[PDB]
Amino acid sequence: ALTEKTDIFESGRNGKPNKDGIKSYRIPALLKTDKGTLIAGADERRLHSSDWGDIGMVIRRSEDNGKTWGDRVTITNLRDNPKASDPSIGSPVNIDMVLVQDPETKRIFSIYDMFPEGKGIFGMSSQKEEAYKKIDGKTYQILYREGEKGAYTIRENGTVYTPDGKATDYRVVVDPVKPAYSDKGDLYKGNQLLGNIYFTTNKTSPFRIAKDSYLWMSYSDDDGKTWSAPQDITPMVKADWMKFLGVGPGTGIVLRNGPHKGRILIPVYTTNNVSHLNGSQSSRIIYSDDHGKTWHAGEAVNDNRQVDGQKIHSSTMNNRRAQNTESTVVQLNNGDVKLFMRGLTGDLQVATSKDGGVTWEKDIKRYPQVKDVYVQMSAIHTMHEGKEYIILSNAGGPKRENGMVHLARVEENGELTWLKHNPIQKGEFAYNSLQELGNGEYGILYEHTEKGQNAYTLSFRKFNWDFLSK
Amino acid sequence: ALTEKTDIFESGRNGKPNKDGIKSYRIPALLKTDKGTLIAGADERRLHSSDWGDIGMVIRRSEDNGKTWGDRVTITNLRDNPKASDPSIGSPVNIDMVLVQDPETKRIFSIYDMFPEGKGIFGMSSQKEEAYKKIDGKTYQILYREGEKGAYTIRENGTVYTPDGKATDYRVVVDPVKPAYSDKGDLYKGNQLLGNIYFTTNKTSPFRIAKDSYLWMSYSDDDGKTWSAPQDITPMVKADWMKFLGVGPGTGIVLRNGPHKGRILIPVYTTNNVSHLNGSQSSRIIYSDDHGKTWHAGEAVNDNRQVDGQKIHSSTMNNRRAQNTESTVVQLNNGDVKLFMRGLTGDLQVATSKDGGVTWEKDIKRYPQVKDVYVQMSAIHTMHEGKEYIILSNAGGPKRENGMVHLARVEENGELTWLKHNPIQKGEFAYNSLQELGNGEYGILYEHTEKGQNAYTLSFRKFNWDFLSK
Ligand SMILES: CC(=O)N[C@H]1[C@H]([C@H](O)[C@H](O)CO)OC(C(=O)O)=C[C@@H]1O
Ligand SMILES: CC(=O)N[C@H]1[C@H]([C@H](O)[C@H](O)CO)OC(C(=O)O)=C[C@@H]1O
Ligand SMILES: [Cl-]
């Protein structure tokens, strides 16, 4: 059996905003917390549906295990540029979240992309501006002044600082904010405002950050009810050559066994300056061994990998077919990590790691039993009456439609046997996130539209083992 | 006055190897030391005059102000691949050197390029191979093993470690090297010599280093009679995005003024993976503030540089004309650093640093009164009775011909106004290196051909100044 859909994030209708003024909801993430709570995350795309604009990172909570859901809690929404001529592209952007709970600390992390005002990924500059500087062993974000060339950093209490190293006070950027963090990056000269460092057009202040892709994180210590101010984790994980670095949205994992047990894995992907979105999309994970304090980049699956007798690297590649993008991560009972990667083979592409996410084996396994129409997927480990299984959910196709939940037995070394492919949602079907619910039940937050819904409405369903196996 | 042609590094004739079977000599570097000694350095290009093959770093000394010269002392020459099916491209390569002396320590530095077997610069791999890896960092050089993906590292005493971090113990590379350092890189299984980590063709050992460009350093404390084993400085200065990193050959300086007195400046240039040789050649310096122990990279002249309306970076640029390659550096008495860069404008190109070679000013000064036929140049600071004077020497044109010596008056602001341009050599003329001999006398080692000489024969000329004035 399978429950009827419960709509958790309701988008507007026929191009028009909903009751709150919001046209679109988008990128689902679902988390089952130690307290038994269900946390549902999404992009709140106010006016409109594209991969940019006024977008907030929002969650909702359920305590009755998915029956009823509380209020929308906004984690982060950066304030729009009020003097931008095109308001649909006139806001700093947060986009795509990953959720994970550290089982030791009970801390819940939401990691998500950040772009200043622009078209977030489809609006990146073709030239690099340095985003960060290491002054005397400490890393500070850079600022670029109008007309002037040179450093400018952000130190101490948001006190700016000239390329001279002179504490040119008057100037402060806010980073211990305050309201719902919409005032992050606000620039003051005195007690009076001015502008915001994430503003790109028609600026009322002289300072902006570098035009780049960024990676932010916020945490909750009260089961998802209140969230910390965004931590900029970018410099810990982003290399000099990297153009884009963003999350593979959905739900991350904590390793439960082997010598790296307790390691947090967050799926991510990069583009390089050689081919950007045309032929360099490359999956990897970032990880933390200290309960979310510091983060590190693992190697890309495409690093030192052989395609057609020629080795590639994610920093230099230009090959459309060899890309792998958004991914979903799972650990086996034998300690292996499997990375299910969105790609362009029409097939399920899977990478294998032996050292817990850092390095990847030579070959990408392909399963013709599971279609991939170039859309996000979620997969989870689950134990049923002995051993062992993985549950994977994505569009059946052709196109982003006919939602499928696929069931595989985990064999031996460490092989997968696809046992059944059960339809879960007819009509439009895109992004989705699976969770184990306890007691042989499972949950899913997925993208789907009906009856003129804008794109997308995010909906929840429970199901049991019978729905999966017969 | 001007002294007649005095050859130091004699090339061959009409495609014949000279007395010692060395067809070609190339890339002059001239240094006068603390004891008054002159050092002349060259590419010992044994097999041809191309930018690859079997090349040794060699010097010849003079105690008598360049009257007569001592014999050849090989700094470094890596042994050839005896199994390579083409000897002309069948050797690990060293190429281009900078000479410089620390005034306080008297240590003389030779900084030069290195490539494994191949066409060094004209034969670089299309895709990135990681060359180094931090482990409890601790940075080690990577080895790749035929048939396998995965690190392999060179650790203590040259012991090869497996990608897992297990000692192969058996496998070891020669790091403290002995002979002419010709055994550097040799790979052993115990006392069994198998091959060399710098060979890339028809290999006899299982391991090779990354196909990349490297930057090596040797030093002598005995005024140039013996030299240490090559030190690999690459990982201190070469960023991840960099394809090529190599020196602007000739002679370096030490800062004598300002808040950075004692800093050693080595001119270098980089390429990127977007356009490599076709549009990315970018001049910068590397420097040492601790007497040549540790090195750091300065920012490129092309970093955040407004050109043709747009801002570029050395890591992302594709602009042929905006390139700046080999360069020579001088400090002014007001503390400014000037960088004369080989370019493709036909003009002389000059950039200014006000923080001792790290950052560069918005603007590149073009001096039409001075020609540049896209070839290396040489410049030195020199006081004579007044203020302030710089000598710049290069080709006259059209083509690599007519050795010119130009003089400029260093104004206080501090621009420079050119006074006279005097021919020092007729015929075909290319690379050169200038020094200050004292008593208002100057010396120049340069590149020249006559009587069917293989190119080049590298000749010396001593003289002032009435040549410059009158
Ligand atoms: C940060 C961002 O833009 N993420 C978006 C992603 C990305 O643009 C694409 O993977 C580029 O190749 O595309 C999609 C999509 O519905 O297909 C949704 C994400 O919101
Ligand atoms: C590292 C190296 O090869 N240096 C060479 C240099 C280089 O190829 C060029 O600067 C690329 O544009 O070319 C020349 C030259 O004929 O002028 C001489 C140098 O030996
Ligand atoms: Cl602003």
Author numbering:
A (entry chain A), B (entry chain B): 322 to 791
From the paper:
Streptococcus pneumoniae genomes encode three sialidases, NanA, NanB and NanC, which are key virulence factors that remove sialic acids from various glycoconjugates. Sialidases are one key virulence factor as they remove sialic acid from host cell-surface glycans, probably unmasking certain receptors to facilitate bacterial adherence and colonization. The 115 kDa NanA is the largest of the three sialidases and is anchored to the bacterial membrane. Although recombinantly expressed full-length NanA was soluble, it failed to crystallize; therefore, a 56.5 kDa domain that retained full enzyme activity was subcloned.
In this paper, we report the 2.5 Å resolution X-ray crystallographic structure of the catalytic domain of S. pneumoniae NanA and its complex with the inhibitor 2-deoxy-2,3-dehydro-N-acetyl neuraminic acid (Neu5Ac2en). Data were collected at 100 K to 2.5 Å resolution from a crystal grown in the presence of the inhibitor 2-deoxy-2,3-dehydro-N-acetyl neuraminic acid. The crystal belongs to space group P212121, with unit-cell parameters a = 49.2, b = 95.6, c = 226.6 Å. The two monomers in the asymmetric unit are related by a noncrystallographic twofold axis, superimpose with an r.m.s.d. of 0.39 Å over 470 Cα atoms and bury ∼1200 Å2 of surface at their dimer interface. The active site contains the usual catalytic residues common to all sialidases: three arginines (Arg347, Arg663, Arg721) that interact with the carboxylate group of sialic acid, a nucleophilic tyrosine (Tyr752) that is proposed to form a covalent intermediate and its associated glutamic acid (Glu647), an aspartic acid (Asp372) that acts as an acid/base and a hydrophobic pocket that accommodates the acetamidomethyl group of sialic acid. In common with other bacterial sialidases, the hydroxyl group at C4 on Neu5Ac2en interacts with an arginine (Arg366) and an aspartic acid (Asp417). The O8 and O9 hydroxyls of the ligand’s glycerol group interact with Tyr590 and Gln602, respectively. The topology of the surface of CNanA around the location of the aglycon is flat and open, in line with the promiscuity shown by NanA towards α(2,3), α(2,6) and α(2,8) linkages (unpublished data) and in contrast to leech sialidase and Trypanosoma cruzi trans-sialidase, which show specificity for α(2,3)-linked sialic acids. Two inhibitors of the influenza virus neuramini­dase, zanamivir and oseltamivir, are currently licensed as treatments for influenza and both were developed based on the framework of Neu5Ac2en. The study reported here lays the groundwork for the potential elaboration of the core of Neu5Ac2en, particularly around the acetamido and glycerol moieties, in order to develop specific inhibitors of the pneumococcal sialidases.
